[PDB]
């Protein structure tokens, strides 16, 4: 009982997230709570081998004195993914948080 | 002179996600099936 590679490739083409938002608490609860930054556009490529990767880097402006510990992907708003950042960061002043690249997998 | 300046603190990360999958299926070799009507029968030619 498992999806074939063709099934995964067909499946991933429907997930089309286009914005990313950061949080200081895990958005596994109500996803719109504890929002810390404005949404930033993000693009993804075609699914190959059941995996999609971000096309380019994304720069997110962290408001001064804010903290970021988690993130979530949004579409037409529905949050499709959530996760925790590699390290909780305390932006004592305004700064830039860089997402080099993020991928979604079915394996 | 001795001078100092300030810059914006920049950080980078690698967030990625994955899901996984499963499949299931159940059955058996059939016999008789199920019928609402079930009575003794006689079959002439």
Output the DSSP codes for A15-62: ----EEEEESS-TTSSTTTTB-S--EE--B---BTTEEEBSS-EEEEE
Query: Which residues in chain A touch residue B20, judged by CB atoms under 8 angstroms apart?
Result: 106-107
The C-alpha atoms of residue A96 and residue B29 are separated, in whole angstroms, by 63
Among residues A29, A16, A11, the alpha carbon closest in space to that of A73 is found at: A16
With beta carbons less than 8 A apart as the criterion, state whether A20 and A74 touch: yes
Residues of chain A contacting B11 with CB distance shorter than 8 Å = 87, 89, 95-98
Contact check, Cβ <8 Å, B10/A104: no
Is residue A34 a contact partner of residue A67, using CB atoms and an 8 Å limit? no
Which method, experimentally, gave rise to this model?
cryo-EM
Question: Which residues of B lie inside 8 Å of A (Cβ-Cβ)?
Answer: 8-25
Q: Which residues on adjacent β-strands are paired with residue A19?
A: A41, A74
State the DSSP code for A5: H
DSSP three-state, residue A8: helix
CB-based burial label for A11 (10 Å; 0-12, 13-18, 19+): middle
Neighbours of B30 (CB within 10 A): 7
Quoted resolution (Å): 3.1
Is A106 close to B20, i.e. CB distance below 8 A? yes
What value, to the nearest 5°, has the Cα angle with vertex B42 and ends B36 and B43?
105
Rounded (to 5) percent helix, strand, coil in chain A: 5, 45, 50
From CA B11, how far away is CA A86, in angstroms rounded? 10
User: Smallest Cα–Cα separation from B16: which of A33, A71, A5?
Assistant: A71
Residue of A nearest to B13 (CA): A99
């Amino acid at each position: 009982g498992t999806l074939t590679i063709d099934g995964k490739n067909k499946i991933l083409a429907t997930l089309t997230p286009t914005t990313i938002i950061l949080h200081n608490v895990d958005p596994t609860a109500d996803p719109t709570a504890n929002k810390v930054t404005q949404p930033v556009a993000i693009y993804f490529s075609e699914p190959d081998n059941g995996l999609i990767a971000s096309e380019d880097t994304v720069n997110i402006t962290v408001p001064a004195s804010a903290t970021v510990s988690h993130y979530s992907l949004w579409d037409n708003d529905k949050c499709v993914a959530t996760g925790a950042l590699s390290k909780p960061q305390f932006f004592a002043e305004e700064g830039i948080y860089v997402i080099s690249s993020v991928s979604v997998d079915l394996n | 002179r001795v001078h100092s300046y300030r810059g914006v603190l920049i950080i980078t990360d690698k967030l990625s996600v994955e899901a996984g999958s499963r499949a299931s299926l159940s059955g058996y070799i059939s016999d008789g099936g199920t019928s609402d009507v079930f009575t003794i029968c006689r079959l002439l030619d």
